[PDB]
Amino acid sequence: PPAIREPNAEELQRAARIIRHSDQPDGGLALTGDKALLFHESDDAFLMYARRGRSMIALYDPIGPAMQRAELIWQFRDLCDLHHARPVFYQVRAENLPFYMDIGLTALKLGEEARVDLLRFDLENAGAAMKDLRYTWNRGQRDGLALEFHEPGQAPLDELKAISDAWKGFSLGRFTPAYLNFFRIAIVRHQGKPVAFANLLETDSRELASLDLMRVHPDAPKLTMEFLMLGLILHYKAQGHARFSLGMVPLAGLQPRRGAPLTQRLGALVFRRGEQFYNFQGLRRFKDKFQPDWEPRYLAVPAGLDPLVALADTAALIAGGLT
Ligand SMILES: [Cl-]
Ligand SMILES: [Cl-]
Ligand SMILES: [Cl-]
């Protein structure tokens, strides 16, 4: 069998095209180039993966049209058997689960993704949740916080490096010019001084927009984070987008429920930090400030086999990274 390689600049450009034609902005993580690309025979859809141990671990569901997604999943199983490796899918949607079942994979709960319904989101709606955001938006504007947007290529990357340094791989983006040049970038300035930034995952449609890197200067005001997020939500709402993703919160960050099946517990082993799980304290509570809708995300592993092995390889690949 041939060699698993990183994609070239021609392949990356082809992948970038596929993402634009999709409703899957999170596919933009393929553009770091540290993930191998499995293109459909039509070159209208791709799947991204990495190898760790005897496992081949795909990142997210395949990027592309519905039918091509399903056929890529079968392609991947074929490719995995050709290399004598076990297929693993990291952070997949429940709707694609039947396809993973068909190639002989079961699943473990990994966490939950928070997405804000932009069409329903309004700061003048009821509830104290909206009240607090109105305060954050005005109090923050008094204090000199301002959100700006830069087309791809723009934005002082030297000023971004300052925040980035004061503040990996596979499931995350990389602070490199080659990568950040692909995306729109939002910057928060405290009375002119850069205090936070974030690259923006978009598509040519307005179905979904999400996040990747989001780094904040440690000396920045407390509200900078909340302000930056709220600003992005209002921004994409105005642009006419339907949903905005705040990212995922792994199991340990959700409300603890023991007495639960191992299927909905074992997924925690992906995020271990020494003698402790990453607890992701307040991460759920923070995302909940914007009243998002939560949806499960799964880790697809070979069925009828001890998932501890695939969990180990997945844990190693992730190396503790999250948005
Ligand atoms: Cl996702
Ligand atoms: Cl999907
Ligand atoms: Cl402060």
Side-chain angles (χ1 to χ4, degrees), residues 143 219-223:
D143 301 342
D219 301 334
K222 350 138 297 180
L223 287 176

mmCIF file of all heavy atoms in Angstrom, residues 143 219-223, ligand 3:
data_model
loop_
_atom_site.group_PDB
_atom_site.id
_atom_site.type_symbol
_atom_site.label_atom_id
_atom_site.label_comp_id
_atom_site.label_asym_id
_atom_site.label_seq_id
_atom_site.Cartn_x
_atom_site.Cartn_y
_atom_site.Cartn_z
ATOM 1 N N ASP A 143 -16.120 50.956 28.582
ATOM 2 C CA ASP A 143 -14.760 50.686 29.038
ATOM 3 C C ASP A 143 -13.738 50.715 27.903
ATOM 4 O O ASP A 143 -12.539 50.562 28.140
ATOM 5 C CB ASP A 143 -14.701 49.336 29.753
ATOM 6 C CG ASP A 143 -15.636 49.269 30.945
ATOM 7 O OD1 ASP A 143 -16.068 50.342 31.423
ATOM 8 O OD2 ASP A 143 -15.937 48.145 31.402
ATOM 9 N N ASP A 219 -3.786 40.294 30.572
ATOM 10 C CA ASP A 219 -3.962 41.571 31.252
ATOM 11 C C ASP A 219 -5.211 42.300 30.766
ATOM 12 O O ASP A 219 -5.529 43.390 31.246
ATOM 13 C CB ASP A 219 -2.730 42.459 31.053
ATOM 14 C CG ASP A 219 -1.457 41.816 31.573
ATOM 15 O OD1 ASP A 219 -1.545 40.966 32.486
ATOM 16 O OD2 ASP A 219 -0.366 42.161 31.068
ATOM 17 N N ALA A 220 -5.912 41.693 29.813
ATOM 18 C CA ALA A 220 -7.138 42.274 29.273
ATOM 19 C C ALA A 220 -8.240 42.276 30.326
ATOM 20 O O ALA A 220 -8.194 41.486 31.269
ATOM 21 C CB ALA A 220 -7.585 41.511 28.036
ATOM 22 N N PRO A 221 -9.227 43.175 30.178
ATOM 23 C CA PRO A 221 -10.387 43.194 31.079
ATOM 24 C C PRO A 221 -11.108 41.849 31.131
ATOM 25 O O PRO A 221 -10.977 41.042 30.210
ATOM 26 C CB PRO A 221 -11.288 44.267 30.466
ATOM 27 C CG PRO A 221 -10.351 45.180 29.763
ATOM 28 C CD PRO A 221 -9.234 44.318 29.246
ATOM 29 N N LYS A 222 -11.859 41.616 32.201
ATOM 30 C CA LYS A 222 -12.577 40.360 32.377
ATOM 31 C C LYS A 222 -13.588 40.143 31.257
ATOM 32 O O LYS A 222 -13.749 39.028 30.759
ATOM 33 C CB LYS A 222 -13.292 40.333 33.729
ATOM 34 C CG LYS A 222 -12.909 41.471 34.661
ATOM 35 C CD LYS A 222 -14.133 42.045 35.360
ATOM 36 C CE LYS A 222 -15.098 42.662 34.357
ATOM 37 N NZ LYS A 222 -16.309 43.228 35.014
ATOM 38 N N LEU A 223 -14.262 41.219 30.860
ATOM 39 C CA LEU A 223 -15.364 41.121 29.908
ATOM 40 C C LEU A 223 -14.922 40.861 28.472
ATOM 41 O O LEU A 223 -15.751 40.516 27.634
ATOM 42 C CB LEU A 223 -16.211 42.395 29.949
ATOM 43 C CG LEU A 223 -17.101 42.574 31.179
ATOM 44 C CD1 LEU A 223 -17.810 43.916 31.133
ATOM 45 C CD2 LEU A 223 -18.105 41.439 31.279
HETATM 46 CL CL CL B 3 -11.402 44.694 34.536
#
